[PDB]
Write an enzyme that holds these catalytic residues in place. Structure first.
Site, PDB file in Angstrom:
ATOM      1  N   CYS B 108       6.571  -3.482   7.574  1.00  0.00           N
ATOM      2  CA  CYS B 108       5.932  -4.654   7.053  1.00  0.00           C
ATOM      3  C   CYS B 108       5.984  -5.900   7.967  1.00  0.00           C
ATOM      4  O   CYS B 108       7.057  -6.435   8.239  1.00  0.00           O
ATOM      5  CB  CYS B 108       6.606  -5.051   5.770  1.00  0.00           C
ATOM      6  SG  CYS B 108       5.760  -6.504   5.040  1.00  0.00           S
ATOM      7  N   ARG B 111       7.106  -9.989   6.453  1.00  0.00           N
ATOM      8  CA  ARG B 111       8.410 -10.300   5.882  1.00  0.00           C
ATOM      9  C   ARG B 111       8.872 -11.799   6.041  1.00  0.00           C
ATOM     10  O   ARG B 111       9.868 -12.162   5.494  1.00  0.00           O
ATOM     11  CB  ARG B 111       9.491  -9.284   6.351  1.00  0.00           C
ATOM     12  CG  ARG B 111       9.330  -7.796   5.894  1.00  0.00           C
ATOM     13  CD  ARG B 111      10.373  -6.925   6.564  1.00  0.00           C
ATOM     14  NE  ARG B 111       9.873  -6.375   7.829  1.00  0.00           N
ATOM     15  CZ  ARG B 111      10.639  -5.890   8.806  1.00  0.00           C
ATOM     16  NH1 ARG B 111      11.944  -5.876   8.659  1.00  0.00           N
ATOM     17  NH2 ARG B 111      10.108  -5.443   9.957  1.00  0.00           N
ATOM     18  N   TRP B 280      -0.606  -9.976  -0.087  1.00  0.00           N
ATOM     19  CA  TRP B 280      -1.986 -10.259   0.278  1.00  0.00           C
ATOM     20  C   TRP B 280      -2.278  -9.515   1.583  1.00  0.00           C
ATOM     21  O   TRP B 280      -1.343  -9.101   2.290  1.00  0.00           O
ATOM     22  CB  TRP B 280      -2.255 -11.763   0.362  1.00  0.00           C
ATOM     23  CG  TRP B 280      -1.332 -12.547   1.235  1.00  0.00           C
ATOM     24  CD1 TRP B 280      -1.364 -12.639   2.621  1.00  0.00           C
ATOM     25  CD2 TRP B 280      -0.257 -13.415   0.803  1.00  0.00           C
ATOM     26  NE1 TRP B 280      -0.370 -13.496   3.052  1.00  0.00           N
ATOM     27  CE2 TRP B 280       0.331 -13.966   1.967  1.00  0.00           C
ATOM     28  CE3 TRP B 280       0.251 -13.785  -0.451  1.00  0.00           C
ATOM     29  CZ2 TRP B 280       1.424 -14.862   1.910  1.00  0.00           C
ATOM     30  CZ3 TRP B 280       1.350 -14.663  -0.505  1.00  0.00           C
ATOM     31  CH2 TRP B 280       1.924 -15.186   0.666  1.00  0.00           C
ATOM     32  N   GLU B 285      -6.220  -4.764   8.061  1.00  0.00           N
ATOM     33  CA  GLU B 285      -6.076  -3.645   7.136  1.00  0.00           C
ATOM     34  C   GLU B 285      -7.448  -3.272   6.608  1.00  0.00           C
ATOM     35  O   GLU B 285      -7.807  -2.099   6.503  1.00  0.00           O
ATOM     36  CB  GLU B 285      -5.142  -4.009   5.974  1.00  0.00           C
ATOM     37  CG  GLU B 285      -3.653  -3.953   6.292  1.00  0.00           C
ATOM     38  CD  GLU B 285      -2.797  -4.576   5.202  1.00  0.00           C
ATOM     39  OE1 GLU B 285      -2.178  -3.806   4.436  1.00  0.00           O
ATOM     40  OE2 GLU B 285      -2.761  -5.829   5.087  1.00  0.00           O
TER      41      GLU B 285
HETATM   42  C1  HEM Z   1       2.737 -11.242   1.578  1.00  0.00           C
HETATM   43  C2  HEM Z   1       1.751 -10.689   2.293  1.00  0.00           C
HETATM   44  C3  HEM Z   1       2.008  -9.357   3.014  1.00  0.00           C
HETATM   45  C4  HEM Z   1       1.396  -8.965   4.126  1.00  0.00           C
HETATM   46  C5  HEM Z   1       0.328  -9.679   4.967  1.00  0.00           C
HETATM   47  C6  HEM Z   1       1.902  -7.666   4.457  1.00  0.00           C
HETATM   48  C7  HEM Z   1       1.490  -6.995   5.566  1.00  0.00           C
HETATM   49  C8  HEM Z   1       1.686  -5.666   5.692  1.00  0.00           C
HETATM   50  C9  HEM Z   1       0.941  -4.779   6.527  1.00  0.00           C
HETATM   51  C10 HEM Z   1      -0.252  -5.085   7.470  1.00  0.00           C
HETATM   52  C11 HEM Z   1       1.495  -3.563   6.354  1.00  0.00           C
HETATM   53  C12 HEM Z   1       1.019  -2.251   7.037  1.00  0.00           C
HETATM   54  C13 HEM Z   1      -0.161  -1.784   6.176  1.00  0.00           C
HETATM   55  C14 HEM Z   1      -0.767  -0.484   6.660  1.00  0.00           C
HETATM   56  O1  HEM Z   1      -0.611  -0.069   7.836  1.00  0.00           O
HETATM   57  O2  HEM Z   1      -1.438   0.162   5.817  1.00  0.00           O
HETATM   58  C15 HEM Z   1       2.574  -3.658   5.395  1.00  0.00           C
HETATM   59  C16 HEM Z   1       3.379  -2.606   4.996  1.00  0.00           C
HETATM   60  C17 HEM Z   1       4.369  -2.680   4.062  1.00  0.00           C
HETATM   61  N1  HEM Z   1       4.731  -3.817   3.306  1.00  0.00           N
HETATM   62 FE1  HEM Z   1       3.879  -5.611   3.501  1.00  0.00          FE
HETATM   63  N2  HEM Z   1       2.900  -7.309   3.575  1.00  0.00           N
HETATM   64  C18 HEM Z   1       2.946  -8.308   2.619  1.00  0.00           C
HETATM   65  C19 HEM Z   1       3.744  -8.307   1.490  1.00  0.00           C
HETATM   66  C20 HEM Z   1       4.571  -7.292   1.073  1.00  0.00           C
HETATM   67  C21 HEM Z   1       5.351  -7.207  -0.157  1.00  0.00           C
HETATM   68  C22 HEM Z   1       5.346  -8.248  -1.318  1.00  0.00           C
HETATM   69  C23 HEM Z   1       6.079  -6.067  -0.098  1.00  0.00           C
HETATM   70  C24 HEM Z   1       7.065  -5.414  -1.104  1.00  0.00           C
HETATM   71  C25 HEM Z   1       7.970  -6.068  -1.840  1.00  0.00           C
HETATM   72  C26 HEM Z   1       5.761  -5.412   1.130  1.00  0.00           C
HETATM   73  C27 HEM Z   1       6.314  -4.239   1.552  1.00  0.00           C
HETATM   74  C28 HEM Z   1       5.757  -3.411   2.454  1.00  0.00           C
HETATM   75  C29 HEM Z   1       6.159  -2.006   2.687  1.00  0.00           C
HETATM   76  C30 HEM Z   1       7.290  -1.177   2.021  1.00  0.00           C
HETATM   77  C31 HEM Z   1       5.246  -1.532   3.765  1.00  0.00           C
HETATM   78  C32 HEM Z   1       5.207  -0.143   4.425  1.00  0.00           C
HETATM   79  C33 HEM Z   1       4.361   0.793   3.559  1.00  0.00           C
HETATM   80  C34 HEM Z   1       4.203   2.125   4.235  1.00  0.00           C
HETATM   81  O3  HEM Z   1       5.105   2.517   5.045  1.00  0.00           O
HETATM   82  O4  HEM Z   1       3.182   2.808   3.939  1.00  0.00           O
HETATM   83  N3  HEM Z   1       4.886  -6.194   1.852  1.00  0.00           N
HETATM   84  N4  HEM Z   1       2.715  -4.978   5.043  1.00  0.00           N
HETATM   85  C1  QJ2 Z   2       1.313   7.710   3.503  1.00  0.00           C
HETATM   86  C2  QJ2 Z   2       1.325   6.314   2.918  1.00  0.00           C
HETATM   87  C3  QJ2 Z   2       2.139   6.053   1.807  1.00  0.00           C
HETATM   88  C4  QJ2 Z   2       2.153   4.762   1.265  1.00  0.00           C
HETATM   89  N1  QJ2 Z   2       2.924   4.456   0.196  1.00  0.00           N
HETATM   90  N2  QJ2 Z   2       1.384   3.792   1.804  1.00  0.00           N
HETATM   91  C5  QJ2 Z   2       0.588   4.009   2.882  1.00  0.00           C
HETATM   92  C6  QJ2 Z   2      -0.222   2.839   3.380  1.00  0.00           C
HETATM   93  C7  QJ2 Z   2      -0.147   1.797   2.271  1.00  0.00           C
HETATM   94  C8  QJ2 Z   2      -0.727   0.446   2.639  1.00  0.00           C
HETATM   95  C9  QJ2 Z   2       0.254  -0.719   2.456  1.00  0.00           C
HETATM   96  C10 QJ2 Z   2      -0.645  -1.931   2.283  1.00  0.00           C
HETATM   97  C11 QJ2 Z   2      -0.107  -3.321   1.984  1.00  0.00           C
HETATM   98  C12 QJ2 Z   2       0.870  -3.570   1.022  1.00  0.00           C
HETATM   99  C13 QJ2 Z   2       1.237  -4.890   0.742  1.00  0.00           C
HETATM  100  C14 QJ2 Z   2       2.290  -5.074  -0.331  1.00  0.00           C
HETATM  101  C15 QJ2 Z   2       0.620  -5.976   1.429  1.00  0.00           C
HETATM  102  C16 QJ2 Z   2      -0.348  -5.672   2.412  1.00  0.00           C
HETATM  103  N3  QJ2 Z   2      -1.011  -6.615   3.163  1.00  0.00           N
HETATM  104  N4  QJ2 Z   2      -0.686  -4.379   2.646  1.00  0.00           N
HETATM  105  C17 QJ2 Z   2       0.539   5.275   3.474  1.00  0.00           C
END
Ligand code: HEM
Ligand code: QJ2
Ligand code: HEM
Ligand code: QJ2
Ligand code: H4B
Ligand code: H4B
Ligand code: ZN
Lengths: 404, 404
Positions: B108, B111, B280, B285
């Site tokens: 993420c 953060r 958001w 994305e």
């Molecule tokens: C506040 C605005 C936020 C932005 C701009 C943001 C941005 C992103 C982006 C660009 C990704 C990668 C997405 C992808 O490749 O599909 C991501 C992944 C992630 N975010 Fe955020 N995030 C935000 C908020 C949050 C919140 C509120 C949480 C949880 C409490 C969170 C937890 C995660 C987690 C666990 C991942 C990895 C998911 C995965 O491995 O598939 N994020 N974030």
């Molecule tokens: C294999 C796989 C599993 C999983 N849980 N999620 C993915 C991609 C999920 C996309 C996460 C998107 C996201 C999540 C949040 C919370 C904010 C933000 N800007 N974008 C792939």
């Protein structure tokens, strides 16, 4: 023990069995991955086994393993090592080792080419003066009037009782970086240190941003010696844009030949401290990194302004727009000057072809995901979407300390 | 130097050491012999030790480490685990642990915001109808008519014997993907399984490119019930270009709220199998992955054709130019529409601030470089040049098997 490796675009799956023949640790442990690190933190009975290993590789490749010549060559290596603590490669083995070390290079996207390398034997070299001559023939051959040909040149191995042959320059062709009064830099900031060492050892500097540096060449335990490359050998491509006619005004240029000169080649436990090698550029290396990194020529603002882009705010994506013109300009100007170049789309496509080949041939392919995926438009290319396993195979090019 | 990973920024030349990695209580997939960090994917006494660690964290976070309350809360957890095999978190332990899981998520880039997360407790939930009520409330609060607010809703934890609470959909909002008889997909290809699951449990399908799936919600030990979201609850943005007028005629749109519903939230060994969370979008994305991936909407070619680009050769950079403009279209339209969004430049800039805060606060930060680096203009953003150490810290968001 054998990783499932998936392409996420096509759903396809393979298993790396090749990693099993890695015998040098990388920097990762189960507690933390360190794969994004650029450099690592970083012999009688054992030079021996790397030698067997490697000679084995060599006779397996000419399909004559366990034959007579194989045995009598293993006996040569043994007898040589037993008496002298070291040994020497036959010319054809070196040729094999050199191509295999490219093949194993996990940071290189151009590996589809690997089997096509011209290998100059420069082991009969005893002075900086000769190195220079060998370095000149290489530039002349590899450059080939714009139709570039991969080439390595190999200088004498490191030896137990003395200094290394080394090329001090990081690349055979480099642009001076002049550290100015106000601490700004005219020319390439990547080459500040080498520029100053050249002045220190007697070189008369210019005041351009694209001054071709001389070479600092070092024969064992001698002061390095300075040679000016003749301007006629170093081919250079003036940069212009297919539509943006003012782009030509900005006096931009890059050189044709990307020739790495500070890496060490390792084959069968022998180490070749000086062994410059060259191919041809992928256009993002110049158009994106060398010209756009903020700690290089850092020309993005200049271009964007000339393109009349709203600079004030990141959200107009002025950075992305100008980066793309500059990359287009590098391809355009190279194709005009009829100099070999490859875009990141063609290059990564061909790299995908290479993984498939290597999957059939060896069971895998060591690959560094962060270096393979290009620096613009990453997910637009098919490698973004391909999982990759990284690991060290020998023969190998390795980084080595700087001589000074 | 110190024996913790040394970590370097190549743009600025600065060095740090990550000491935080010593806290990792779990192994990733890498080993000395091979790096595997580009792979997308990997109760008895073990609970107790996990629980004691989480509770120690809670009390340090409130600066009451060693206090009577701390050892009395320890005592408490040990008794509860000792007689029922599990244990329950106090309310503010849940808020802390939730925030800590986001803080811990190496993938993420968002953060910098980890401190501002509204945590809705829903551990009282006892039916699929009620899950739906909580999700609708969550969506309303989070969307807040375009001025988006990060939030998580935590449904009851797993219990021995009894079945999990589960949101079958991967996100609260997903567009249908209908498999054609001719082999193509209409809509979003990522969502083909969940579409065909929704139909099997009795949803009446539509036939657009952008149909909102109903939710498949599984109360413990029940088949999942099906729920449709009121259209007024799902905020959507029609896409248009600030200067290419025809872009608006393409009929493209995306939803405002990115809300992940398929992850497990783990805390002190307690496992929340349904705790959807939302923030958001970063514009890449939507504009680069969701619209341009070949296995998704795949509109790159259609868009280049409208732009009148040369689509028959890689070297016109037709892909790069179309992607940029699609990305501009994403930002512009979210801006025009007063829906929170951030571009990959501003976002990575602030993740650099986040790394620097975390360095001071905890001595490092787990970060997955391949996911932190945006999928267009990589080296144009400052995270490209930042080495990063990836490792697993708890609380954690974790992947889990689909419940079907
Ligand atoms: C506040 C605005 C936020 C932005 C701009 C943001 C941005 C992103 C982006 C660009 C990704 C990668 C997405 C992808 O490749 O599909 C991501 C992944 C992630 N975010 Fe955020 N995030 C935000 C908020 C949050 C919140 C509120 C949480 C949880 C409490 C969170 C937890 C995660 C987690 C666990 C991942 C990895 C998911 C995965 O491995 O598939 N994020 N974030
Ligand atoms: C294999 C796989 C599993 C999983 N849980 N999620 C993915 C991609 C999920 C996309 C996460 C998107 C996201 C999540 C949040 C919370 C904010 C933000 N800007 N974008 C792939
Ligand atoms: C034929 C055209 C070639 C192309 C287009 C190519 C492409 C590339 C690219 C784009 C990189 C990343 C470099 C950077 O970001 O600065 C690279 C790295 C590398 N290439 Fe190639 N390559 C080519 C030929 C060769 C040859 C002939 C060799 C050796 C004989 C070679 C060995 C290497 C090695 C060892 C690296 C890693 C560099 C390092 O770790 O610093 N490549 N290649
Ligand atoms: C940290 C570091 C060390 C080092 N020796 N070299 C580098 C960058 C070297 C650039 C390699 C460029 C190259 C080499 C070759 C053979 C072809 C091509 N297209 N490009 C970085
Ligand atoms: C820190 C990071 O690993 C470093 O910037 C790498 C990323 N990927 C790269 N990829 C290539 N081809 N060349 C590079 O110099 C880099 N830099
Ligand atoms: C193979 C590779 O690991 C895979 O395509 C990853 C790369 N980086 C990514 N980064 C983000 N943010 N999201 C992704 O889905 C991916 N995909
Ligand atoms: Zn690793």
């Amino acid at each position: 023990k054998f990783p499932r490796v998936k392409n996420w675009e096509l759903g396809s799956i393979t298993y790396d069995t090749l990693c099993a023949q890695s015998q040098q640790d990388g920097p990762c442990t189960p507690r933390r991955c360190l794969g994004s690190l650029v450099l690592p933190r970083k012999p009688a009975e054992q030079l021996l086994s790397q030698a067997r290993d490697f000679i084995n590789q060599y006779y397996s490749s000419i399909k004559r393993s366990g034959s007579q010549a194989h045995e009598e060559r293993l006996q040569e290596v043994e007898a040589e090592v037993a008496s002298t603590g070291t040994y020497h490669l036959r010319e054809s083995e070196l040729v094999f080792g050199a191509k295999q070390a490219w093949r194993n290079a996990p940071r290189c996207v151009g590996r589809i080419q690997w089997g096509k390398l011209q290998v100059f034997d420069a082991r009969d070299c005893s002075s900086a003066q000769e190195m220079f001559t060998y370095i000149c023939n290489h530039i002349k051959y590899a450059t080939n009037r714009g139709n570039l040909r991969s080439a390595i040149t190999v200088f004498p191995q490191r030896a137990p009782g003395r200094g290394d042959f080394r090329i001090w320059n990081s690349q055979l062709v480099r642009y001076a970086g002049y550290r100015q009064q106000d601490g700004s830099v005219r020319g390439d900031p990547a080459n500040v240190e080498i520029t100053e060492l050249c002045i220190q050892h007697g070189w008369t500097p210019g005041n351009g941003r694209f001054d071709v540096l001389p070479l600092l060449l070092q024969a064992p335990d001698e002061a390095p010696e300075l040679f000016v490359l003749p301007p006629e050998l170093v081919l250079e491509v003036p940069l212009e844009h297919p539509t943006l006619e003012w782009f030509a005004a900005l006096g931009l240029r890059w050189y044709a030949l990307p020739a790495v000169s500070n890496m060490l080649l390792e084959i069968g436990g022998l180490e070749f401290s000086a062994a410059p090698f060259s191919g041809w550029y992928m256009s993002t290396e110049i158009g994106t990194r060398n010209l756009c990194d903020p700690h290089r020529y850092n020309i993005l603002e200049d271009v964007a302004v000339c393109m009349d882009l709203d600079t004030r705010t990141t959200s107009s994506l002025w950075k992305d727009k100008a980066a793309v013109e500059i990359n287009l300009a590098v391809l355009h100007s190279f194709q005009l000057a009829k100099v070999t170049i490859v875009d990141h789309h063609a290059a990564t496509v061909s790299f995908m072809k290479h993984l498939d080949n290597e999957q059939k041939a060896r069971g895998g392919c060591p690959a560094d995901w962060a270096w393979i995926v290009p620096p613009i438009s990453g997910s637009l290319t098919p490698v973004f979407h391909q999982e990759m396993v990284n690991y060290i195979l020998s023969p190998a090019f390795r980084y080595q300390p700087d001589p000074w």
